[PDB]
Amino acid sequence: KSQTAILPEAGPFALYTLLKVRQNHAHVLQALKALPALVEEINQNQPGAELTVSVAFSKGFWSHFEMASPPELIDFPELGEGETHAPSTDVDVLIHCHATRHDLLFYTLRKGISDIAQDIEIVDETYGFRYLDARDMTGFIDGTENPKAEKRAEVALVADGDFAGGSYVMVQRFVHNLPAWNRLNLAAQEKVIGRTKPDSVELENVPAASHVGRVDIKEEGKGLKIVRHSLPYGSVSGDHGLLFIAYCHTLHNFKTMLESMYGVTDGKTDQLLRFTKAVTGAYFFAPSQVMLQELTLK
Amino acid sequence: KSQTAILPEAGPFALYTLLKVRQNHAHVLQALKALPALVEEINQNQPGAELTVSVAFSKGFWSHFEMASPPELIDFPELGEGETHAPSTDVDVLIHCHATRHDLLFYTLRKGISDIAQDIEIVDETYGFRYLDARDMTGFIDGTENPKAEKRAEVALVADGDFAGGSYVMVQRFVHNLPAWNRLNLAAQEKVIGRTKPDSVELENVPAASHVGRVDIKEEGKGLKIVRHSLPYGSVSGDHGLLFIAYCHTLHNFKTMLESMYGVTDGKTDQLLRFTKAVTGAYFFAPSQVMLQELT
Ligand code: HEM
Ligand code: HEM
Secondary structure: OOOOOOOOOOOOEEEEEEEEEOOOHHHHHHHHHOHHHHHHHHHHHOOOOOOEEEEEEOHHHHOOEOOOOOOOOOOOOOEEEOOEEEOOOOOOEEEEEEEOOOHHHHHHHHHHOHHHOOOEEEEEEEEEEOOOOOEOOOOOEOOOOOOOOHHHHHHHOOOOOOOOOOEEEEEEEEEEOHHHHHHOOHHHHHHHHOEOOOOOOEOOOOOOOOHHHHHOOEOOOOEOOOEEOOEEEEOOOOOEEEEEEEEEOOOHHHHHHHHHHEOOOOOOEOHHHHOEEEOOOEEEEEOOHHHHHHOOEO | OOOOOOOOOOOOEEEEEEEEEOOOOHHHHHHHHOHHHHHHHHHHHOOOOOOEEEEEEOOOHHHOOOOOOOOOOOOOOOEEEOOEEEOOOOOOEEEEEEEOOOHHHHHHHHHHHHHHOOOEEEEEEEEEEOOOOOEOOOOOEOOOOOOOOHHHHHHHOOOOOOOOOOEEEEEEEEEEOHHHHHHOOHHHHHHHHOEOOOOOOEOOOOOOOOHHHHHOOOOOOOOOOOEEOOEEEEOOOOOEEEEEEEEEOOOHHHHHHHHHHEOOOOOOEOHHHHOEEEOOOEEEEEOOHHHHHHOO
């Protein structure tokens, strides 16, 4: 059994919290374990909320656990240079929630960490929201080729072993340059993305440097697929863009797409990265519900 | 006719923007005048959105109008002493929106303002949201005694004259100190607010220093009423609290309440201000739809 946030389709609103554990590690772990029980209680008090949660830990923080770390779990490596850079964030824990209402997300975080506020530093706290008809602020629909129904389970979740039901996670908070992106016309923007803007139909000739051209990778030969839970975020006068987050049964897919996007593989960078920049970056592993409740410090 | 955001009840989501005008005043004003048409168009394209808008101007910016300022419109004065202080924010325009969805609030602001972003500096941009069962983040329900239905029109809107249909506006962004508020027990919090916490029942004895005690003012009268469109805002790790915004036919009600709260009237300050602090304070006047389009 995976954690409730991973498999279902993303709700209209989402919470993505990155935090660092400074002290009282045992108290913090307990508080994190008690999140599912809190969420269940909220759902019982609030029909239609469909509140979900997934707690994940970084490679560095996993050392504190008695349970052995996932085979592929590593630190998020920095990629690229200058205007095409993928920063690495010092973070121990990811808290991911999504629901049909925004307020319960704030409540879940406030109530959930109330006792461990002084033990924790929240590195980043992003509230995502569905934008129009599932569109990114770039005007293009996001999630068109995102796995659906049954194949979500076999793409996101580890199939076998001790970590079965668990999932590898990546997150990158992107900040958009909307005016620069606005300069390009419809056809040009479609060349950057690789799909049509109004109906998200894949172009007959997908440019290799286009975003889809960068991330549509098959090497098996079978497509490297991930389950994305990303959602637009931010304000007009401040940071705004996309909180990218994805789950996968293997971290290899993340690494391949990122190395392809940031010019490690081909030497060519993603055209989309001309109009957006990653400000955070981290790898995690979200264990099954059982393992999460069985995790203990050493 | 008033502006669409004032009279109806506040939606589950709201946008509150304070901004200052750098230059190109003529074609910052025109862009602001175009906002109602934009909101209506969004409402047509998005049924059920119930998107609304209200544009208001401060006393400082009303100098640019050939039209004279409302008789009661003043610069927001600094009030209080000690921890209890009411800061004054130099701002030209207020853009107030609320709807049944959040995404259209960002869409409305980005669309309506980005063209004049070169001429405009956003002083504050706050996204409010109704929290649980209409509760403030202190755990107390907000809006229990807020005017309803037929009362809203007579409380918020100017009845007569040239400025009829318009409304005086006040805005204050509050920052809550929740852990300090958390140290107090249930009874102490209720005495500070002036009502019971779970069901917002007014205390038989409302202390003069309590928040209700400060704002429940009698002038014979004896009921000074305002229409509050306030809504909780913010993040856990950052600023969070209440974006207070209120409409009224007279600015006198705002000034009287604020004088009472910050220990100017009697010398006693609002007990609630021990746990929250205003970081923004401003007065406006939202013109009627007619005056709005003819302001020059
Ligand atoms: C940063 C790492 C990212 C990765 C690893 C990633 C991954 C993917 C994948 C696997 C697909 C589907 C490919 C296919 O068609 O088979 C996709 C599509 C797409 N992504 Fe990304 N993405 C990233 C960032 C972004 C950003 C920052 C944006 C927007 C600002 C974005 C917007 C889109 C759009 C518009 C599509 C096409 C429609 C769709 O199938 O969802 N992506 N991405
Ligand atoms: C952090 C700031 C504030 C908080 C948390 C707060 C909270 C509350 C609460 C819980 C109530 C009782 C429920 C209700 O009747 O709505 C109330 C009442 C009220 N408040 Fe506030 N308030 C704040 C600021 C203000 C300010 C600055 C003003 C005026 C300048 C104001 C004016 C009023 C009025 C007119 C009432 C109705 C009292 C009555 O007639 O029973 N509030 N407030």
